[PDB]
Short mmCIF file of all heavy atoms in Angstrom, two decimals:
data_model
loop_
_atom_site.label_atom_id
_atom_site.label_comp_id
_atom_site.label_asym_id
_atom_site.label_seq_id
_atom_site.Cartn_x
_atom_site.Cartn_y
_atom_site.Cartn_z
N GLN B 1 0.84 -1.19 0.00
CA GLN B 1 0.00 0.00 0.00
C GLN B 1 0.88 1.25 0.00
O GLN B 1 0.69 2.16 0.80
CB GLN B 1 -0.96 -0.01 1.19
CG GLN B 1 -2.13 -0.96 1.01
CD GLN B 1 -3.14 -0.85 2.12
OE1 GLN B 1 -2.79 -0.65 3.28
NE2 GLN B 1 -4.42 -0.98 1.78
N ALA B 2 1.84 1.25 -0.92
CA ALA B 2 2.76 2.35 -1.12
C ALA B 2 3.37 2.14 -2.49
O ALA B 2 3.90 3.08 -3.10
CB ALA B 2 3.82 2.36 -0.05
N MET B 3 3.31 0.90 -2.97
CA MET B 3 3.65 0.60 -4.35
C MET B 3 2.42 0.88 -5.21
O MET B 3 2.51 0.97 -6.43
CB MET B 3 4.08 -0.86 -4.51
CG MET B 3 5.50 -1.15 -4.05
SD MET B 3 6.09 -2.69 -4.76
CE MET B 3 4.81 -3.81 -4.24
N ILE B 4 1.27 1.00 -4.55
CA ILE B 4 0.03 1.37 -5.22
C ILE B 4 0.17 2.76 -5.82
O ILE B 4 -0.37 3.05 -6.89
CB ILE B 4 -1.17 1.30 -4.24
CG1 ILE B 4 -2.02 0.06 -4.54
CG2 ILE B 4 -2.03 2.55 -4.32
CD1 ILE B 4 -1.24 -1.24 -4.48
N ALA B 5 0.92 3.62 -5.14
CA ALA B 5 1.19 4.96 -5.63
C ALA B 5 2.26 4.95 -6.72
O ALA B 5 3.18 5.76 -6.70
CB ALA B 5 1.60 5.87 -4.49
N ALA B 6 2.13 4.02 -7.65
CA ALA B 6 3.05 3.90 -8.78
C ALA B 6 2.34 3.19 -9.92
O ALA B 6 2.97 2.82 -10.91
CB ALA B 6 4.29 3.14 -8.38
N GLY B 7 1.04 2.98 -9.77
CA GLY B 7 0.24 2.33 -10.79
C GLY B 7 0.27 0.82 -10.70
O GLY B 7 -0.44 0.14 -11.44
N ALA B 8 1.09 0.29 -9.79
CA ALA B 8 1.20 -1.16 -9.62
C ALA B 8 -0.15 -1.76 -9.22
O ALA B 8 -0.81 -1.25 -8.32
CB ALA B 8 2.26 -1.49 -8.59
N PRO B 9 -0.55 -2.84 -9.90
CA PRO B 9 -1.88 -3.45 -9.76
C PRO B 9 -2.15 -4.06 -8.39
O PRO B 9 -1.35 -3.94 -7.47
CB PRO B 9 -1.86 -4.55 -10.83
CG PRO B 9 -0.42 -4.89 -10.98
CD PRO B 9 0.30 -3.59 -10.84
N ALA B 10 -3.30 -4.73 -8.28
CA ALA B 10 -3.73 -5.34 -7.03
C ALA B 10 -2.92 -6.60 -6.71
O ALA B 10 -2.32 -6.70 -5.65
CB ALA B 10 -5.21 -5.66 -7.08
N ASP B 11 -2.93 -7.56 -7.63
CA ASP B 11 -2.16 -8.78 -7.46
C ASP B 11 -0.67 -8.45 -7.41
O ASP B 11 0.07 -8.66 -8.37
CB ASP B 11 -2.46 -9.80 -8.57
CG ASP B 11 -2.34 -9.21 -9.96
OD1 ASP B 11 -3.24 -8.45 -10.37
OD2 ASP B 11 -1.34 -9.50 -10.64
N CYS B 12 -0.24 -7.92 -6.27
CA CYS B 12 1.10 -7.37 -6.14
C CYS B 12 1.88 -8.05 -5.03
O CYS B 12 1.30 -8.52 -4.05
CB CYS B 12 1.01 -5.86 -5.89
SG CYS B 12 2.34 -4.90 -6.64
N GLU B 13 3.20 -8.09 -5.18
CA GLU B 13 4.06 -8.71 -4.19
C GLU B 13 5.32 -7.88 -3.97
O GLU B 13 6.21 -7.87 -4.82
CB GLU B 13 4.45 -10.12 -4.61
CG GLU B 13 3.30 -11.12 -4.57
CD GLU B 13 3.67 -12.46 -5.18
OE1 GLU B 13 4.72 -12.53 -5.85
OE2 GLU B 13 2.91 -13.43 -4.98
N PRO B 14 5.39 -7.17 -2.84
CA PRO B 14 6.57 -6.38 -2.49
C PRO B 14 7.76 -7.27 -2.18
O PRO B 14 8.90 -6.80 -2.22
CB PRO B 14 6.13 -5.63 -1.24
CG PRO B 14 5.06 -6.47 -0.65
CD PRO B 14 4.34 -7.07 -1.81
N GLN B 15 7.49 -8.54 -1.87
CA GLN B 15 8.51 -9.54 -1.57
C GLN B 15 9.62 -9.03 -0.66
O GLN B 15 10.79 -9.02 -1.03
CB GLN B 15 9.10 -10.12 -2.85
CG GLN B 15 8.21 -11.14 -3.52
CD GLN B 15 8.95 -11.99 -4.53
OE1 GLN B 15 10.04 -11.63 -4.98
NE2 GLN B 15 8.37 -13.13 -4.89
N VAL B 16 9.24 -8.61 0.54
CA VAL B 16 10.21 -8.13 1.51
C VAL B 16 10.61 -9.25 2.47
O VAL B 16 9.76 -9.87 3.11
CB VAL B 16 9.68 -6.90 2.28
CG1 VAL B 16 8.18 -6.92 2.31
CG2 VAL B 16 10.27 -6.84 3.68
N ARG B 17 11.91 -9.49 2.54
CA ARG B 17 12.45 -10.49 3.45
C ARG B 17 13.51 -9.85 4.32
O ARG B 17 13.80 -8.66 4.18
CB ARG B 17 13.08 -11.64 2.67
CG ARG B 17 12.31 -12.06 1.44
CD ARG B 17 13.08 -13.14 0.69
NE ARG B 17 14.47 -12.75 0.47
CZ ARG B 17 15.40 -13.55 -0.04
NH1 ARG B 17 15.09 -14.79 -0.39
NH2 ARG B 17 16.64 -13.11 -0.20
N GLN B 18 14.08 -10.64 5.22
CA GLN B 18 15.19 -10.19 6.03
C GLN B 18 16.41 -10.05 5.14
O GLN B 18 16.55 -10.78 4.16
CB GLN B 18 15.46 -11.19 7.16
CG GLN B 18 14.31 -11.33 8.13
CD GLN B 18 14.29 -12.66 8.84
OE1 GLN B 18 15.22 -13.46 8.72
NE2 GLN B 18 13.23 -12.91 9.60
N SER B 19 17.28 -9.10 5.47
CA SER B 19 18.46 -8.81 4.66
C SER B 19 19.43 -9.98 4.59
O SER B 19 19.34 -10.93 5.36
CB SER B 19 19.18 -7.56 5.18
OG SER B 19 18.34 -6.42 5.10
N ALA B 20 20.38 -9.91 3.65
CA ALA B 20 21.38 -10.95 3.49
C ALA B 20 22.66 -10.54 4.19
O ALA B 20 23.39 -11.37 4.72
CB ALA B 20 21.64 -11.20 2.01
N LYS B 21 22.95 -9.24 4.17
CA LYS B 21 24.11 -8.70 4.86
C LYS B 21 23.68 -7.59 5.80
O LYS B 21 22.60 -7.02 5.64
CB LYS B 21 25.15 -8.18 3.86
CG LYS B 21 26.09 -9.23 3.29
CD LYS B 21 25.40 -10.12 2.27
CE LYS B 21 26.29 -11.27 1.84
NZ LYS B 21 25.58 -12.18 0.90
N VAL B 22 24.53 -7.27 6.77
CA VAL B 22 24.22 -6.22 7.72
C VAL B 22 24.37 -4.86 7.06
O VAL B 22 23.92 -3.84 7.59
CB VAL B 22 25.14 -6.30 8.96
CG1 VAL B 22 26.51 -5.73 8.64
CG2 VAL B 22 24.52 -5.56 10.14
N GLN B 23 24.99 -4.84 5.89
CA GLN B 23 25.17 -3.60 5.15
C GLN B 23 23.98 -3.33 4.24
O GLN B 23 23.90 -2.28 3.60
CB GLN B 23 26.46 -3.65 4.33
CG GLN B 23 26.47 -4.73 3.28
CD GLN B 23 27.82 -4.85 2.59
OE1 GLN B 23 28.85 -4.53 3.18
NE2 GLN B 23 27.81 -5.29 1.35
N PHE B 24 23.04 -4.27 4.20
CA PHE B 24 21.82 -4.10 3.44
C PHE B 24 20.65 -3.80 4.37
O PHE B 24 19.49 -4.02 4.01
CB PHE B 24 21.51 -5.34 2.60
CG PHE B 24 22.51 -5.60 1.51
CD1 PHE B 24 22.61 -6.85 0.93
CD2 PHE B 24 23.35 -4.59 1.06
CE1 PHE B 24 23.53 -7.09 -0.07
CE2 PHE B 24 24.26 -4.82 0.06
CZ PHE B 24 24.36 -6.08 -0.51
N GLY B 25 20.96 -3.30 5.56
CA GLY B 25 19.94 -2.98 6.53
C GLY B 25 19.42 -4.20 7.25
O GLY B 25 20.09 -5.24 7.29
N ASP B 26 18.23 -4.09 7.81
CA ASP B 26 17.62 -5.19 8.54
C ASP B 26 16.60 -5.92 7.67
O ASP B 26 16.28 -7.08 7.91
CB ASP B 26 16.97 -4.69 9.82
CG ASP B 26 17.94 -3.95 10.72
OD1 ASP B 26 19.15 -4.22 10.63
OD2 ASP B 26 17.49 -3.10 11.51
N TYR B 27 16.10 -5.23 6.65
CA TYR B 27 15.12 -5.81 5.74
C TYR B 27 15.28 -5.30 4.31
O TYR B 27 15.59 -4.13 4.09
CB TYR B 27 13.70 -5.55 6.23
CG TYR B 27 13.28 -6.39 7.41
CD1 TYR B 27 13.43 -5.94 8.71
CD2 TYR B 27 12.71 -7.65 7.22
CE1 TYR B 27 13.05 -6.71 9.79
CE2 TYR B 27 12.32 -8.42 8.29
CZ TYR B 27 12.49 -7.95 9.58
OH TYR B 27 12.10 -8.73 10.65
N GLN B 28 15.05 -6.18 3.35
CA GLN B 28 15.10 -5.82 1.94
C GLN B 28 13.69 -5.82 1.37
O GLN B 28 12.83 -6.54 1.84
CB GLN B 28 15.91 -6.85 1.15
CG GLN B 28 17.32 -7.08 1.64
CD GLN B 28 18.02 -8.15 0.83
OE1 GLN B 28 17.51 -8.61 -0.19
NE2 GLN B 28 19.20 -8.56 1.28
N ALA B 29 13.47 -5.01 0.34
CA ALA B 29 12.24 -5.10 -0.45
C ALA B 29 12.63 -5.45 -1.88
O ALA B 29 13.22 -4.64 -2.59
CB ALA B 29 11.49 -3.79 -0.41
N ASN B 30 12.29 -6.67 -2.29
CA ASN B 30 12.77 -7.20 -3.57
C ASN B 30 11.77 -7.08 -4.72
O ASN B 30 12.12 -7.28 -5.88
CB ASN B 30 13.19 -8.66 -3.41
CG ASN B 30 14.27 -8.85 -2.37
OD1 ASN B 30 15.04 -7.93 -2.09
ND2 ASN B 30 14.34 -10.04 -1.80
N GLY B 31 10.52 -6.77 -4.39
CA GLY B 31 9.44 -6.82 -5.37
C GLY B 31 9.48 -5.80 -6.49
O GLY B 31 8.57 -5.76 -7.32
#
């Protein structure tokens, strides 16, 4: 509900997981 402000449709997946490295923060958004 923030990717919606980009025209992105309903069937949407932000695909956010925990980061891989500590230099990539605590969480990534891959979608």
Side-chain angles (χ1 to χ4, degrees):
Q1 284 186 323
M3 283 199 305
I4 254 57
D11 52 285
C12 215
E13 290 172 347
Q15 282 197 342
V16 27
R17 320 176 310 173
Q18 297 155 7
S19 298
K21 276 74 187 176
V22 78
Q23 62 186 28
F24 294 161
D26 303 334
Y27 285 93
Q28 304 178 9
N30 302 335

